[PDB]
Each structure stands twice: as structure tokens, then as C-alpha cells.
């Protein structure tokens with residue numbers, strides 16, 4: 001059913017938020033080790 | 035310069051942008067070669083010949099495909115099957131293919147002879163069309179004129195050029211029309227006129243978009 | 256007769272005008288490019304290679320689609336499916352595919368393995384035909400010779416010229432006949448050899464006319 | 473790797489001897505594959521190159537478009553009925569009850585097939601006319617095949633070096649979509665079921681459920 005759907009939908013704001021505050025510094029990581 | 039010129043009509047009209055090789059020097063040059071199949075001048079010359087011949091045959095085809103079906107109702111006619119597609123069985127009829135239903139008219143019941151004669155007849159005609167036989171030996175290939183222009187309608191260059199545009203536009207219209215007859219004959223086994231009659235009787239109860247549209251997948255007529 | 260400006264033409268005497276690029280110097284040149292598809296010399300070269308490869312495959316196919324049917328109806332051998340448009344179904348049977356009907360020949364049972372082995376073997380073979388390999392280096396992409404002419408039937412250049420014509424001529428006839436095999440099979444579910452026997456039995460009644468045709472509408 | 477004389481080719485190690493001279497490796501997705509010599513003419517090559525990109529993007533949209541509806545209904549979200557099957561979701565509007573959307577009648581609820589049809593010709597025809605001829609509305613027209621800012625809203629193509637690599641990724645994802653779109657078609661005309669359903673059959677009995685299972689389907693039986 002949708003039980004797993006609704007719960008998984010909680011990840012989208014979380015994943016989007018983590019990136020909004022980590023993407024930039026992450027890009028420094030793979031660029032340094034490139 | 036109307037049809038033959040840089041300011042000629044085009045297939046997209048306003049937004050239409052003409053290709054470099056297409057310059058309007060030839061009739062029907064609405065600047066439609068987005069695929070790029072005529073970039074070669076020699077190929078383009080050959081394609082123009084094919085276009086007119088495919089156009090001319092279709093014009094004869096459109097009239098020949100509609101005459102038996104039309105005369106069948108609007109006039110007096112007893113064709114075995116007025117439909118253009120079901121015209122081969124006319125020779126397979128009991129008394130053979132009878133022109134206009136007349137037992138004396140042609141009255142051919144030999145597929146071998148009618149097919150063999152056509153190969154002899156059309157074989158010379160197409161052969162003469164290419165090597166320039168007696169009915170015009172050194173004329174233009176695509177536009178011979180001369181003996182093939184008995185009435186001499188296009189005897190003036192200016193007029194002839196415009197008539198050429200008309201020949202293609204009527205011909206190009208005919209070519210798409212033949213396509214319609216075929217696709218519809220497949221989707222609906224009826225003569226083009228019978229299909230038209232359905233659209234006349236009900237232009238909203240026949241639109242393929244219903245009559246057969248949801249009948250091309252999953253399930254069909 | 257088959258080369259140069261005096262070469263024979265596809266339309267015979269009525270040929271008259273011929274494509275300027277379509278001169279002699281190549282086998283099977285009858286001056287037929289009315290569609291003007293080989294105006295570009297680069298494309299003409301490619302089309303020449305495609306024709307001879309389609310032709311060589313057709314010759315193999317024409318002989319390969321008739322022999323099992325001939326042998327079956329001549330009593331020479333008993334196959335699972337003699338007709339070509341059904342021989343593929345042999346892999347979906349109790350005994351798989353047995354060459355010449357002998358259970359101790361090939362005896363294939365898995366269509367995948369047949370497909371997998373063909374992909375690997377044909378892939379390498381076609382790669383060798385376009386980049387050289389174990390059989391030889393590439394000089395002519397369509398006429399390698401050397402390891403592919405062990406008998407030396409084309410050692411003399413004059414015989415090589417006339418022989419190339421024979422291949423394209425025989426090849427073209429194979430392509431037309433193999434195209435017939437495709438259509439005859441759809442219109443007549445009978446095999447092509449069976450069709451030939453029926454036409455010989457009663458040509459007036461057994462032909463594309465007086466049968467089918469009207470059904471094709 | 474994807475540009476220059478040492479780019480990846482279509483015949484791998486056997487391609488060195490079969491790469492058309494014109495294919496020098498100057499455009500995205502050049503694996504040197506013109507066996508028919510169709511793109512030998514410079515102009516014809518350019519016109520085709522444009523077609524290839526357009527056919528690709530349409531396909532890339534087509535892939536998700538053909539799988540999204542059936543996926544959602546199966547995912548346990550929304551409902552579609554025949555609308556799930558991409559090859560049968562062409563009567564949903566003709567199916568009385570509004571075409572709707574994500575199974576919500578409060579949406580398009582389209583029923584007039586003649587409506588969507590006409591509007592389509594008008595709306596797309598324009599967007600195609602601009603695409604056919606660069607137009608002012610477009611803020612960044614430059615090359616017709618690759619309009620920038622106006623269409624490059626996120627400006628991911630702003631970096632020139634990335635644009636090359638990114639253009640190669642565009643055509644390659646596009647060609648994969650085109651190949652799969654041709655698959656969805658044939659798969660349907662033969663199996664007559666959903667592409668996702670087809671996948672379910674292969675996942676069920678991979679050795680039994682495959683293309684050769686329906687090989688005898690169109691036997692020219694007398």
C-alpha cells in the first residue's frame with residue numbers, strides 16, 4: 001500500500017535539507033581528491 | 035517572382051527559413067527540406083523528377099480511384115466492386131472485367147494477357163520517356179511538352195512556370211489524398227466516398243479518433 | 256560488354272541517359288541509379304560494399320532455404336522442420352535441433368546458447384572482416400582474396416573482372432528470389448519448393464492469381 | 473575518450489579500419505558509425521545530427537512518460553486503469569470520465585478528444601516554428617540545436633568544458649532512450665502487455681519468458 005510511501009516521503013525534505021547545507025563543502029572533497 | 039523567387043511562399047510561412055540549396059528556381063519550392071535529403075544537386079535533380087512523376091500518377095490515381103465508386107450511386111453504373119482496392123477481382127469476375135458493366139466493353143477475363151500487355155505497353159512508354167523516342171526525341175526529361183502538349187496551354191514561359199507550380203500543388207495534394215484512401219481502406223474497409231459519406235452523415239460519430247482510434251491497441255475492429 | 260562506356264544497361268536500348276557518376280569500372284554496372292542515391296562518391300563506395308554483402312548473404316540464404324526442403328520432399332533426409340520459415344522452431348521441440356535429423360549431430364537444446372554463440376562468433380567474424388585478423392589483413396573490404404581464394408580462381412586479373420560480374424549478377428538474382436521467399440511464405444504458408452511444385456502441377460490454377468490475391472484485397 | 477582521434481568507437485578494437493573520414497570526432501556521440509555513408513554530405517550530416525538530437529530528447533521524455541503512469545498505479549499511489557499502459561493510455565480522454573490526471577478528476581478531466589488535438593497543433597506548432605527558426609522570445613538562441621539560458625534555466629551548460637562532456641551525456645542517454653523506446657514499441661506489438669509487465673515475466677521465468685517464447689506468434693500459417 002502507501003504505508004511505506006508516506007514514511008519514505010519524509011526523506012525528501014531531509015535529503016534536500018542536508019544537501020542545502022553540505023553540498024558545497026562536499027564539492028570541495030571530491031575536487032581535492034580528484 | 036511570386037512562386038519562383040527569394041520571397042516565395044514557404045511551408046512554415048512566417049517562421050519558415052529556406053535551406054541554402056533551395057532557392058525557388060524550381061516549382062513547389064516552399065523550402066521544406068529539414069531532413070536534408072536534397073543537399074546534393076544531382077540527387078536533388080533526380081528527386082524533383084520522382085516528385086512530379088509520383089505527383090502525376092497520383093492525380094490519375096485519385097480520379098481513377100473515385101470514378102467507379104462515384105458513378106455507382108450518383109450515376110448509372112454496375113461495377114462489380116466500385117471500391118478502388120477491390121478492383122482486381124473484376125478480372126476474376128464470372129464474365130471477366132467488363133468496362134462500365136457492358137458485356138462487350140473490353141470483356142477481359144485473362145490476368146495473364148492484361149498483365150503481359152501492360153508490361154509491353156508501359157515498358158515502351160517508360161523506355162521512350164527516358165531515351166527520347168519518336169514522340170519527342172530531344173525534349174526536356176521532366177517537362178517534355180511538344181507532342182505531349184497538344185492544346186498548347188503553356189506556350190508562354192511566364193504562364194508555363196506558374197502552371198508548373200499548379201501541377202505540383204494539385205499533384206502533391208493528390209499524393210497525400212491517395213495515402214488517405216489507403217490508410218482508411220485498411221483502418222475501415224470502405225471506398226473513400228463511403229468514408230466521406232460517414233463523415234457527412236455524422237462528422238462526430240465517425241472521426242477515427244473514436245470509430246477505430248481506441249481500436250489500434252489491446253483490441254481492434 | 257560489362258565494363259566501360261559501352262557496357263550493357265538495365266533499360267537496354269531505351270536506357271539513353273545514364274547517371275554521370277555511374278560509369279563503368281565496377282562490376283554489375285547497368286546504369287541504374289534513377290533515384291540518384293549514389294551521387295556522392297563516398298556513399299557510392301559504401302552502397303557498393305552493402306550490395307555485395309547483402310548479395311553474398313542472399314546466395315547463402317537462397318541455397319540454405321531450399322536444400323532442407325528439397326531433401327525432405329525428395330526422401331534424401333528427414334528434418335524436424337524443412338520449411339525455412341519454421342526451421343527456427345526446431346529448437347522448441349522434444350529433441351532440440353538435430354542436423355539432418357540425426358540425433359548425433361549438433362543436438363542443440365538451448366536457444367540462448369545458440370544466440371550467445373552466434374553473437375560472439377559473428378561479432379568477431381564481422382570485426383575481422385572490417386579490421387583484419389586471423390584470416391588476413393584488410394586490403395579490399397569486399398574482395399580480400401588470399402586466404403579467401405585458396406583455389407585461385409581469380410589469380411588472373413581478366414578472369415577476376417568477369418568473375419566479379421558473375422557474383423553480383425548471381426547475387427542480385429539471389430536477393431530478388433530471397434525477397435520472393437519472404438513474400439511467398441506470407442501469402443502462401445507453404446514452403447517455396449512446395450510452391451514451385453504446385454505451379455508445375457497446375458500453373459493455370461495454382462499461381463498468385465486464381466488464388467490468394469483477392470484474399471489480400 | 474569521447475572527442476578527438478582517440479575517441480571510443482562503435483566496433484571497439486575492430487573499428488580502427490572502419491570509421492568514416494567525415495566522422496573526425498568533432499560532435500557529441502561520434503563513435504564513427506556511418507556504414508551506409510548517409511552523413512557523407514556535410515549538409516546532410518548536419519541536418520541528421522539535428523534530427524538525432526530531437527528524436528533523442530522526445531524519446532528521453534517518452535521513456536518516463538510511458539512508464540510513469542503504470543509505475544504510480546503499481547507503486548500503490550494514484551490510479552489509472554488503462555491509462556497505466558502507455559500504448560492504451562490514448563483513449564483515457566475518449567473514455568467518457570475526464571482523462572483527469574494522477575487519478576484526480578479535479579484536474580484536466582479532459583473528455584473532448586478534438587479539444588486536446590486542435591490545441592496541440594496550435595501550441596506545439598508555434599514552439600516548433602521557433603525551434604525551426606531562432607526567435608526573439610528566446611533569451612539565448614545561439615545555435616538552434618543548443619539554445620542556452622532561455623532553455624538552460626539552471627545554467628548547468630554555462631561551463632564550456634562541462635557542456636561538451638554534458639552534450640555527450642545528453643545524446644548517449646538519448647540514444648539509450650531511443651533504443652528502449654523502439655523496444656517498448658516492438659515489445660507491445662508482440663507481447664501486448666505493459667513494458668513493466670514484460671519485465672515481470674522475465675523476472676519470473678527468465679529462461680522461459682523471453683522474446684523467443686512468442687517467436688512463432690506471427691507464423692504465416694496457411
Ligand code: CHL
Nearest residue numbers: 340341342343344346366370437440441687688690691692
Ligand atoms: C537473420 C534473419 C532471420 C530471419 C529473416 C528470421 C525469420 C524468422 N525466424 Mg528466426 N529469423 C532470422 C534469424 C534467426 N532466427 C533464430 C532463431 C529463431 C527461432 C528460435 C525461431 C525463429 C523463427 C522465425 C520465424 C518467426 C515466425 C514466422 O514464421 O514469421 C513469418 C515471417 C516471415 C514469413 C518473413 C520473415 C522475414 C522478413 C523479411 C523479416 C525482415 C527482414 C529481416 C529482419 C532482416 C534483418 C535481420 C537481422 C536484423 C538479423 C521467421 C520467419 C520462429 C519460427 O521459425 O517458428 C516457426 C522461431 O521459433 N528464429 C536465430 C538464432 C537465434 C537467428 C539468427 O540469425
Ligand SMILES: CC(/C=C/C=C(C)/C=C/[C@@]12O[C@]1(C)C[C@@H](O)CC2(C)C)=C\C=C\C=C(C)\C=C\C=C(C)\C=C\[C@@]12O[C@]1(C)C[C@@H](O)CC2(C)C
Nearest residue numbers: 343370374378484662682683684685686687688689690691
Ligand atoms: C549483438 C548484441 C549485443 C552486443 C553487445 C556488445 C556489442 C557489448 C557491449 C560492450 O561495448 C560495451 C557496451 C562496453 C565494451 O567495453 C565491452 C562490450 C561488451 C563490447 C545483442 C543481441 C541480442 C539479440 C537478441 C537477444 C535477440 C532476440 C530475438 C528474438 C527473441 C526474436 C524472436 C522473434 O523473432 C522471432 C525469432 C520470430 C518473430 O516472428 C517473433 C519474435 C518474437 C520477434
Ligand SMILES: CC1=C[C@H](O)CC(C)(C)[C@H]1/C=C/C(C)=C/C=C/C(C)=C/C=C/C=C(C)/C=C/C=C(C)/C=C/C1=C(C)C[C@H](O)CC1(C)C
Nearest residue numbers: 287288289290292309312313316319320339342430433434
Ligand atoms: C538499383 C537501384 C537504383 C536506384 O537507386 C533505385 C533503387 C530501386 C533504390 C535501387 C534498387 C535497389 C534494390 C532492388 C534493392 C533490393 C534489395 C533486396 C531485395 C535485398 C535482399 C536481401 C536478402 C538477403 C540478404 C537474404 C538473406 C537470407 C538469409 C540470411 C537466410 C537465412 C536462413 C536460412 C538459409 C534458412 C533458415 O531456415 C532460416 C534462416 C536462418 C533465416
Ligand SMILES: CC1=C[C@H](O)CC(C)(C)[C@H]1/C=C/C(C)=C/C=C/C(C)=C/C=C/C=C(C)/C=C/C=C(C)/C=C/C1=C(C)C[C@H](O)CC1(C)C
Nearest residue numbers: 505506507508509527530531534537538558561650653654
Ligand atoms: C548510426 C547509423 C549508421 C549507418 O550508416 C546507418 C544506420 C544504421 C541507419 C544509422 C543508425 C540509425 C539508428 C540506430 C536509428 C534509430 C532511430 C530510433 C529507434 C529512434 C527512436 C525514436 C523514439 C522516440 C522519438 C519516442 C517517442 C515517444 C514519444 C514522443 C511519447 C510517447 C508517449 C508517452 C511519453 C506516454 C503515453 O502514455 C503514450 C505516448 C504519448 C505514446
Ligand SMILES: CC1=C[C@H](O)CC(C)(C)[C@H]1/C=C/C(C)=C\C=C\C(C)=C\C=C\C=C(C)\C=C\C=C(C)\C=C\C1=C(C)C[C@H](O)CC1(C)C
Nearest residue numbers: 067069088091092094095098099118119121209210212213
Ligand atoms: C518531400 C519530403 C520533405 C522532407 O524532406 C521529409 C520527407 C519525408 C523526406 C519528404 C516527405 C514526403 C511526404 C511528407 C509525403 C509523401 C506522401 C505520398 C502518399 C506520396 C504518394 C504517392 C502515391 C502515388 C503516386 C499513387 C499512385 C496510384 C496509382 C497511379 C493508381 C491507383 C489505382 C486506380 C487509379 C484505380 C484502381 O482501382 C486501383 C489503383 C490501380 C491502385
